[PDB]
Design a binder for this molecule. Structure first.
Ligand SMILES: CN1Cc2cccnc2C1=O
Ligand SMILES: CN1Cc2cccnc2C1=O
Lengths: 229, 229
């Protein structure tokens, strides 16, 4: 019995001006934009209560997509940083009838290769967790720590090192307090787990697939061109 | 004035039997095998004294390549592990007239995107180094350390964490002693830097390009299909 969950897709930071170097979320991935394929990983799930995309109010690419005329996709105003945009998504969820104890999933707009297995695996393993968790994969490259002189001080034991992926799964109320307080404190928030970690909580690690990659360079598109359907 | 250097390409571990899931070094990369493109990064360098490929004596793919009939490529017998094959490559270099103080470069057979810039940058920055070093790139993914309960114990400060790449550049005599003694000691050697680290030396880090990737899955080929010429 998988739990019910809301979904927040932070996708702001896009300028008002179309550019030849398009935002990675609007690149073409086998006939569709990256963010459209990212939304498909969630929109069809029976336990989905509602999905909210965080966007700049002057985003020139979004009104061209068919998901902009979709009742299954809600929109929230972007913030100054990613954490602020996630915060506005949490406020938008509260307007749609979300409760403080509802599960919320935050997922990168440029991670379109999220499989149904990883999603349900994350949902079934955290459904009874006291704080939540996130998808992650073990580090497979040799890690080396540097001293101040640029020389190797040690080879890090990567058997305990995991790469942080998305989605990340936390309770709406707790994440709301953690994100808002950490922004007031001046914390260098990266993901939602870092805000929960600063607040004292230890998120659970849920192993996911390694090909759930984030599109950071247009060369990373080439890895996923054969991944659909 | 770049220093003179020998090159060892460990490429053993290949079985005697051709298989449909070919060894990654023999996959096609825009009309040529991965290992052929890897050798091209070195064979044309004016400071190259000699290149040695470590191969199993029953390798069914190598005799089909034109580099098997090339005077510019020498061959050494593979060992039981990668470190042993590297060791036999060092012995093969000594037969070709190498000296104990000569620079040796060890590079992965499945890293064909090594640019001339990274190679010379590694050579010019380590030419006067007391031990040597290796190419590396800074970690750009969020790193999380796991406790014994599978929960995040800390987010690792990745400002001091580097991913270890190749080539790696060490003196022939020192690497020979470090590799041989560490194998006798029972050390879990990964790369040459780990053997030098166990021997007490601190290798220098030389920043290289991030697209000098190792081909571990046939999906990684897709990243490099547009990288040549
Ligand atoms: C994914 N991102 C990046 C960013 C920068 C600034 C404001 N919002 C955002 C957001 O949602
Ligand atoms: C690159 N590799 C892997 C391996 C396994 C066993 C023996 N030699 C080798 C070698 O050179």
């Amino acid at each position: 019995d998988l739990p019910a969950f809301w979904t927040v897709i932070p996708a702001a930071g896009v300028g008002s001006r179309m550019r030849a170097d398009r935002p990675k979320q609007y690149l073409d991935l086998a006939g569709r934009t990256v963010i459209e394929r990212t939304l498909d990983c969630f929109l069809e799930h029976p336990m989905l209560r509602g999905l909210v995309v965080c966007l700049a109010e002057d985003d020139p690419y979004w009104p061209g997509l068919d998901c902009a005329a979709s009742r299954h996709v809600q929109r929230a105003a972007g913030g100054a940083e990613r954490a602020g945009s996630v915060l506005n998504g949490l406020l938008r969820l509260l307007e749609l009838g979300a409760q403080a104890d509802d599960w919320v999933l935050v997922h990168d707009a440029a991670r379109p290769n999220l499989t149904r297995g990883d999603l349900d695996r994350l949902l079934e393993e955290l459904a009874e967790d006291p704080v939540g968790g996130l998808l992650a994969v073990p580090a497979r490259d040799t890690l080396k720590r540097s001293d101040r002189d640029g020389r190797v001080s040690e080879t890090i034991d990567r058997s305990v090192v995991w790469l942080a992926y998305t989605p990340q799964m936390f309770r709406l109320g707790a994440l709301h307090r953690a994100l808002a307080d950490a922004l007031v404190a001046g914390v260098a928030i990266t993901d939602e787990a870092s805000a929960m970690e600063w607040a004292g909580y230890a998120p659970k690690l849920v192993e996911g697939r390694a090909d759930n990659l984030k599109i950071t360079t247009p060369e990373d598109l080439l890895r996923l061109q054969r991944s659909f359907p």
